[PDB]
Amino acid sequence: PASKSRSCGEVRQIYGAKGFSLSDVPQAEISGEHLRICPQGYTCCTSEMEENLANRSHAELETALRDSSRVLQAMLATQLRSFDDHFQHLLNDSERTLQATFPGAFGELYTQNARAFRDLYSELRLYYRGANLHLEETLAEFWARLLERLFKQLHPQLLLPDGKQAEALRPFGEAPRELRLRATRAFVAARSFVQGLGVASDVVRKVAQVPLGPECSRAVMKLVYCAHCLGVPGARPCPDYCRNVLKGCLANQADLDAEWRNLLDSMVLITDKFWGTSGVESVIGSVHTWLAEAINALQDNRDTLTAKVPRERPPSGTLEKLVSEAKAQLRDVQDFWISLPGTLCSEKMADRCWNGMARGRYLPEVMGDGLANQINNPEVEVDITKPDMTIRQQIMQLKIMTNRLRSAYNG
Ligand SMILES: *[C@@H]1O[C@H](CO)[C@@H](O)[C@H](O)[C@H]1NC(C)=O
Ligand SMILES: [Ca+2]
Numbered sequence: 001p002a003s004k005s006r007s008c009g010e011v012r013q014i015y016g017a018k019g020f021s022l023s024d025v026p027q028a029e030i031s032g033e034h035l036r037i038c039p040q041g042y043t044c045c046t047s048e049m050e051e052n053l054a055n056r057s058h059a060e061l062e063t064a065l066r067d068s069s070r071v072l073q074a075m076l077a078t079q080l081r082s083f084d085d086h087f088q089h090l091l092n093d094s095e096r097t098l099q100a101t102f103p104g105a106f107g108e109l110y111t112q113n114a115r116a117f118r119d120l121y122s123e124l125r126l127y128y129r130g131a132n133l134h135l136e137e138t139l140a141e142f143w144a145r146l147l148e149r150l151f152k153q154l155h156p157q158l159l160l161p162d163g164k165q166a167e168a169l170r171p172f173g174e175a176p177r178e179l180r181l182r183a184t185r186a187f188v189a190a191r192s193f194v195q196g197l198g199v200a201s202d203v204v205r206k207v208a209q210v211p212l213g214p215e216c217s218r219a220v221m222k223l224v225y226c227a228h229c230l231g232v233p234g235a236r237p238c239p240d241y242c243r244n245v246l247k248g249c250l251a252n253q254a255d256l257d258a259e260w261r262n263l264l265d266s267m268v269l270i271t272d273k274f275w276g277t278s279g280v281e282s283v284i285g286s287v288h289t290w291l292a293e294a295i296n297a298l299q300d301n302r303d304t305l306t307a308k309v310p311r312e313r314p315p316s317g318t319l320e321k322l323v324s325e326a327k328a329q330l331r332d333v334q335d336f337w338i339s340l341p342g343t344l345c346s347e348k349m350a351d352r353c354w355n356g357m358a359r360g361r362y363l364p365e366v367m368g369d370g371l372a373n374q375i376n377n378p379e380v381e382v383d384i385t386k387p388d389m390t391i392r393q394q395i396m397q398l399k400i401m402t403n404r405l406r407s408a409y410n411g
């Protein structure tokens with residue numbers, strides 16, 4: 001009802017098509033005494049209308065927010081499933097390849113020590129799943145016992161009761177060391193990465209449940225439907241206006257920025273540790289190759305030991321493609337918590353525009369990101385001394401996981 005008409009027709013139709021009584025709409029433009037939210041002036045909105053539209057806009061913002069969150073959560077979840085499943089498959093496939101090829105290559109050497117290898121793979125598996133062990137001692141034990149058994153089997157003629165320190169003549173060659181280093185780096189790398197994906201996923205899932213405040217509700221009502229109430233339903237909110245409003249509403253969520261970026265940075269970094277620097281494939285799916293090399297070494301050092309007294313890394317593999325895609329997706333969503341207002345405004349709510357008093361230009365500067373930066377926010381009045389607890393706990397989770405990944409990166 002501008003341009004020389006006070007008829008509330010369009011406000012009536014819009015308010016009605018939104019599932020509210022058409023009877024509640026005043027026939028013509030009335031006095032605005034009653035308005036709790038919209039600036040007091042001549043309006044087509046009654047109390048019931050204002051409240052209803054407030055509820056509507058609030059619910060709409062909620063829907064948008066949880067939709068975006070749902071997208072992000074879906075992405076992280078699919079990433080998690082993909083990487084976990086692929087690491088497990090690499091290990092399992094290594095084991096199957098060993099079981100299938102070793103009897104031909106080594107015969108009784110392998111077949112009478114199969115449980116040793118199976119046990120080693122089970123230990124590696126437990127180690128990946130997070131059970132608290134480490135490979136140095138486990139592999140050391142493995143190689144000790146394996147050397148014992150293999151030496152016994154090589155020499156049925158001599159009965160050998162017990163303490164063979166002839167080792168570190170390196171009967172198995174360099175393979176035990178290579179396996180030690182590579183497995184130590186790669187498996188904790190993989191585990192920490194997967195753990196990081198899990199943590200990010202849980203953080204998003206939990207943050208999504210943080211409710212919008214009353215201040216935010218009123219500011220959003222003012223942002224969206226106060227244009228309708230003040231006689232300009234065709235008017236749409238100014239981008240910077242919308243952005244200040246949402247920055248006011250989503251300050252707590254925006255406080256996750258620093259630690260989210262830290263976590264995602266360390267997660268991008270840790271993927272490098274999946275491989276070595278020598279142009280060799282990942283040990284996570286090629287343990288059997290090093291085992292086989294160790295056994296070959298032992299065989300061709302059988303005489304010498306007796307003393308009584310790794311295929312090149314493919315240009316592209318599954319893991320590498322997965323890592324590229326993952327790094328793309330993670331670099332893409334590192335800005336999430338502060339990009340929320342911009343994207344939510346750009347997509348849905350937001351060239352002469354509604355500044356919240358009237359149609360026109362919106363002067364005020366866009367606020368910075370984060371709770372503290374909203375102390376002066378003109379559109380939303382936010383108390384900065386009252387942070388949300390859920391957000392804080394999630395930030396702690398991000399801190400912890402990040403530390404885990406930095407340590408994992410170092411070792
Ligand atoms: C790897 O093998 C274990 C042991 O049977 C199994 O539980 C797990 O589902 C397998 N993972 C795969 C096939 O991705
Ligand atoms: Ca982005």
Ligand SMILES: [Ca+2]
Pocket residue numbers: 374375376377380381382
């Ligand atoms: Ca203030």
